[PDB]
Design a binder for these strands. Structure first.
Ligand code: CL
Ligand code: CL
Ligand code: CL
Ligand code: CL
Ligand code: MG
Ligand code: MG
Ligand code: NA
Ligand code: NA
Ligand code: NA
Ligand code: NA
Length: 326
DNA sequence: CCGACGGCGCATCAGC
DNA sequence: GCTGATGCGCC
DNA sequence: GTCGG
């Protein structure tokens, strides 16, 4: 982190744009700039130097000059002092409260953790769980703990059906020493792009993980995606482990490589790769890569037998997961 | 200058 | 009840 | 806010 000061500033700007201004393209622009600066291997000496990086433009270069000179950004100093902006930014830290809900809550006068706790009746199911575990959800998960969680999930899934394959993705698969949450990609030969030969494939797995008290709460659940809370078991006399977020995604078995590409991320990596695909005349989702016809309609799914095949289509050199942390 | 900016699952609500 | 919009979430 | 054409 040679340029941590700058990347922190840009991230705070991004969050303000997303949460307060509700400007999603500005949010993405700031994050893209922060990401490109974060991997730049020199300590940045000026705005002009930064402006040579793709995604850093005139306005960001100016902000960088201000920050290098003074160590702060007047724009941010003002935003921090603003009560409405401060409140909104805080409320969006609760899982389930977005920019819209946060602004609506602040209008009602609900703008602190204390206010939230006394107005549970005003929260939906997801938000009530987000509040319950507010503290826990902001803690990172050490890789050592991720390994214990992997063992529980993989062993429990095997007990449901030995044909399931579960893969931990996200930052874990990128080799991070700590993770924000646990991301699990699940496949079963009965669920392909052509047919669903068994019902409740995801349900059976969630149920089993609940039965062993690993999964503790549910935020949302459908046929292909579960979003919930889990917790490692603690030993006798041991303090409990924090509750953790868990996401499970059931992907058609024949579409594993596209699925694991998506779920490995990072998010900014996915955005960059998908944008590059479009420039190259292709569209990528978690299921397929398809050509874009002259008109605009996506064509038929192209053959994929490896993650690398996807990179080959868009003429990118292959990047191992560890090199996708953007 | 101006259009595009990644793609999608689940929850909630309005209209019919 | 369904369909489409919108919010919020995931990478 | 930035980029491409
Ligand atoms: Cl915007
Ligand atoms: Cl600052
Ligand atoms: Cl695939
Ligand atoms: Cl598809
Ligand atoms: Mg994750
Ligand atoms: Mg994430
Ligand atoms: Na630039
Ligand atoms: Na939130
Ligand atoms: Na996740
Ligand atoms: Na573009």
């Amino acid at each position: 982190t040679l340029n941590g000061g700058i990347t922190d500033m840009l991230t705070e700007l991004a969050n303000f744009e997303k949460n307060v201004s509700q400007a999603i393209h500005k949010y993405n622009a700031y994050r893209k700039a922060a990401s490109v600066i974060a991997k730049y291997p020199h300590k940045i000496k000026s705005g002009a130097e930064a402006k040579k990086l793709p995604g850093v433009g005139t306005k960001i270069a100016e902000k960088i000059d201000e920050f290098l000179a003074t160590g702060k950004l007047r724009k941010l100093e003002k935003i921090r002092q603003d009560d409405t902006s401060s409140s909104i930014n805080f409320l969006t830290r609760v899982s389930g409260i977005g920019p819209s809900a946060a602004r609506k809550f602040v209008d009602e006068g609900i703008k602190t953790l204390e206010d939230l706790r006394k107005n549970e009746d005003k929260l939906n199911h997801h938000q009530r769980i987000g509040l319950k575990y507010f503290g826990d959800f902001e803690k990172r998960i050490p890789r050592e703990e991720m390994l214990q969680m992997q063992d529980i999930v993989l062993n429990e899934v095997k007990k449901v059906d030995s044909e399931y394959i579960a893969t931990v993705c996200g930052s874990f698969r990128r080799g991070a020493e700590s993770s924000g949450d646990m991301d699990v990609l699940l496949t079963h030969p009965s669920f392909t792009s052509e047919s669903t030969k068994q019902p409740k494939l995801l349900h059976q797995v969630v149920e089993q993980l609940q039965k062993v008290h690993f999964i503790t709460d549910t935020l949302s659940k459908g046929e292909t995606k579960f979003m919930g809370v889990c917790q490692l078991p603690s030993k006798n006399d041991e303090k409990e482990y924090p509750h953790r977020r868990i996401d499970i995604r059931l992907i058609p078995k024949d579409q594993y490589y596209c699925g694991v590409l998506y779920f490995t991320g990072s998010d900014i990596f996915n955005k960059n790769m998908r944008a590059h695909a479009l420039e190259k005349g292709f569209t990528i989702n978690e299921y397929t890569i398809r050509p874009l016809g002259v008109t605009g309609v996506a064509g038929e799914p192209l053959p994929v037998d490896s993650e690398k095949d996807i990179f080959d289509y868009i003429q990118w050199k292959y990047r191992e997961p560890k090199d996708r942390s953007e």
